[PDB]
Design a protein around this ligand. Structure first.
Ligand SMILES: [Ca+2]
Ligand SMILES: [Zn+2]
Lengths: 510, 155, 77
DNA sequence: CGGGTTTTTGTTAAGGGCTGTATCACTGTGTAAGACAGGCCAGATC
DNA sequence: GATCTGGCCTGTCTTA
DNA sequence: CTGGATCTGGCCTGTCTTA
DNA sequence: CGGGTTTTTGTCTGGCTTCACACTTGATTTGCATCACTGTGTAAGACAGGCCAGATCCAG
DNA sequence: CACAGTGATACAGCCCTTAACAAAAACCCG
DNA sequence: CACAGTGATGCAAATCAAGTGTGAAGCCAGACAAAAACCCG
């Protein structure tokens, strides 16, 4: 068909097409059901008499986006209903849970022409459904669940703006309407027509696709180099390097709000350090509610980087020679890089990534590294260390540790305790009084995380990075090259690409 | 342009912060008037858009002098009169007047640089200014067209 | 139309010459011959006159045997 | 070669609807080292 | 034993 | 009244942590 | 809770199409598994420690 | 005078429906 | 336990070709059953 036929058919898939209405009318939200791509600034004034604005933004409306996604998944929901031995005319309360994500991007070049002074950065925000469950009879039964939770074909974009993730003012000014809509939606039901039957929908919002940097910046916490290292418990860097296995999740949103209140009001009238101790390192007002979780991608990246460091320290026998110049460490790093290129076919890189991390964690990699170390017992130490790490990783890296690795799940505490003991005894030269964030996050909190959710790898931020790649591609080859319309085009094209109603036409092999 | 904004013909000495300020002011002006973002290395489209009469008009709003204005106007006029000779795919059938008057225009351009631009072009010159003012008519009469043999296709 | 792809430094003279020697050899060889072939069922005759002009000034200085641009002999013509 | 009769086209008195093309403001490929002239301290020196 | 020389640096200019 | 021992203030400077 | 009055259809009835259906074997054409890799992860902030400077204190 | 794109918008072009006529291409008869 | 690619290669499976006689699923002339969905009775 010609291009105008495509343009006309696009209307059915884009948001703002199907009528819907919540039981108890959303607060501070309009009732217009024909609201599609709108301005992202949300009526922010651009007068010279006020704070300067230098960003642009485009976004949907959140409820309209969810209604469009449900219209898109209607067929999958009906097939799930049929496959579980249920009736299609059931209109019970559907329980939906989604996954949120947000990351900043760099090296986004600015274009010529008129317009505001747009910075050379970008920040994206997206959502992704996870599962749908109806309450039939007494217990529950799941109707649909994403088979590929970390795929780029299921990361629906919501908001796109060319700003800086460190600019707190602009970030809040852009994200506050979405958070308001989310909070208003968290206490309402959605009446929606599927196959000619009004269905009831309820939502459970969970945000886990955030790196630690953004969590610390949003949850009203300090930076990563602070003494409070964990975003789940209240331990400090000192105590975290002495116990390593006995901690409990404590941090939460309401607790952070109360903490900030205590910090601002200062009821007991104490000094700055005593007030920091009382508040446990909270000095800002949170504005996004997130659940305590762990990102698997960045966890693996940090673990591989630290292992890398440990390897290039073991090559130099630092456990006996505490003093060392910079040239010695440079020679050690260069020797390790050349040996990895020779035996592992790996190219030495500067910034740690995922594939390098996946290829580095292997027993034969440890053998190739031990080929560089004269000592004997350090070989055994490194081999046992890597064995423990590789026996622990599938617990949090898999999508269902209760069925894909029950042996490693039920024996996760003993492995973590032995790992901590090995760090304290043999590697004392580096982990005496200090330790990284991920190490604590992995050794202390993840069993509670599985017992609280059931999986960690499914709730990662992989799909977010795949969406960043798709964004880089679309902004360059699937959009008008102009500041006034590039973002709307990219957003619409990505929304069309992420849809499932079109992907079924490509699976015409069964 | 940068040197003319700062009046080098009036103050032969200058610090580095003065240079930085001059460049920033020129970049800011060009961004606000000609709609051109600041770039690190000279581009090709930026070069095409930068070489206009309007650009000189916008730049002259920063030079307080009045003769400098005339100097830059005639400079840009001569350069725009010499451009199509080496940029056209067939100057013998697309711009015969510019081809026949290229020598006179080049001589006037050189005289202008030698008289009113001594502060920069005294006892030194680049490569392409020499190539353009000295060797273009002979290459034209020898091959017939410059620009058709450019290295743009490889780029 | 492409003719050669390599992964080498432009400033690296030894590798550049070692890779480009056969091409220049074949070029200089056939610059004194004529080609015949049958297109449309009729044999034809062809003669070539090659002109290397798509070179920036740095590569011209490199291949022609001159020095960097910062010298005093500035013009290559 | 003509009257008489037939077939297969033109045709604007005005609107509906699908299809093709011009328009607008921009984009990506030109992207690392060498030549040189002036200034300044260690140093052989008459 | 201060006196020019030698050589070493270094910022600028030129092409990318 | 004053020279001089000398005890912190902060300052800049790496190092480690997330990206 | 079932009587009138057209729709909606499978046949009865046997006799005319246009496709359907056994075998080869040597190609010829599709369909699908396999293998070594790819991108998206990409700038600042917290904290300890040596160092003088200058204030803090001592005694003739 | 680099040039192949890049997506939405608008307008011209070319098709389609009531009109009876009216001009172009051909046999039966004379 | 990322994943959808990125191209070539190599092997397994479907098919076609020519050969030809029969075999079988339609449609069709009316027709007067057999429900069967409207009306309400
Ligand atoms: Ca990022
Ligand atoms: Zn913790």
């Amino acid at each position: 068909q010609p291009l105008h036929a495509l343009r006309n058919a696009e209307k059915v898939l884009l948001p703002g097409y199907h009528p819907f209405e919540w039981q108890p009318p959303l607060k501070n939200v309009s009732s217009r059901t024909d609201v599609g791509i709108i301005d992202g600034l949300s009526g922010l004034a651009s007068s010279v008499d006020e704070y300067p604005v230098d960003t642009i933004a485009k976004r949907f409306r959140y409820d309209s986006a969810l209604v469009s996604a449900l219209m898109d998944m209607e067929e999958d929901i009906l097939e799930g209903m049929r496959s579980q031995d249920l009736d299609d005319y059931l209109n019970g309360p559907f329980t939906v849970v989604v996954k949120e994500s947000c990351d900043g991007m760099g090296d986004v070049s600015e274009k010529h022409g008129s317009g505001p002074a747009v910075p050379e950065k970008a920040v994206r925000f997206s959502f992704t459904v996870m599962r749908i469950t109806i309450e039939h009879g007494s217990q529950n039964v799941k109707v649909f669940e994403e088979p590929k939770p970390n795929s780029e074909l299921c990361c629906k974009p919501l908001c796109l703006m060319l700003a800086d993730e460190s600019d707190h003012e602009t970030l809040t000014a852009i994200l506050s309407p979405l958070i308001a809509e989310r909070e208003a939606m968290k206490s309402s039901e959605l009446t929606l027509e599927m196959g000619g039957i009004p269905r009831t929908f309820k939502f459970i919002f969970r945000g886990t696709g955030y790196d630690e940097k953004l969590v610390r910046e949003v949850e009203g916490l300090e930076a990563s180099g602070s003494v409070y290292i964990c975003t789940l418990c209240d331990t400090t860097r000192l105590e975290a390097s002495q116990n390593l296995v006995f901690h409990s999740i404590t941090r939460s949103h309401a607790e952070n709000l109360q903490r900030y209140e205590v910090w601002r009001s200062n009821p007991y009238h104490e000094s700055v350090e005593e007030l920091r101790d009382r508040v446990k390192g909270v000095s800002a007002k949170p504005f996004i509610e997130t659940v305590p979780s762990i990102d698997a991608l960045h966890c693996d990246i940090g673990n591989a980087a630290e292992f890398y460091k440990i390897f290039q320290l073991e090559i130099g026998e630092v456990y006996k020679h505490p003093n060392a110049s910079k040239e010695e460490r440079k020679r050690w790093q260069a020797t390790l890089d050349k040996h990895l290129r020779k035996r592992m076919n790996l190219k030495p890189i500067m910034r740690m990534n995922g594939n390098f991390a996946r290829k580095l964690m292997t027993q034969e990699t440890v053998d190739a590294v031990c080929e560089l170390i004269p000592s004997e017992e350090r070989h055994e130490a490194l081999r046992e260390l890597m064995d423990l790490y590789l026996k622990m990783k599938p617990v949090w890296r898999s999508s269902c540790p209760a069925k894909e690795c029950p042996e490693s799940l039920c024996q996760y505490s003993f492995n973590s305790q032995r790992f901590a003991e090995l760090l304290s005894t043999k590697f004392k030269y580096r982990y005496e009084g200090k330790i990284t964030n991920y190490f604590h996050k992995t050794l202390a909190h993840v069993p509670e995380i599985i017992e609280r959710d059931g999986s960690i790898g499914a709730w990662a931020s992989e799909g977010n990075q795949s969406g960043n790649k798709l964004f880089r591609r679309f902004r360059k080859m699937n959009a008008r090259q102009s500041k006034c319309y590039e973002m709307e085009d990219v957003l619409k094209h990505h929304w069309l690409y992420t849809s499932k109603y079109l992907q079924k036409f490509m699976n015409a092999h069964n």
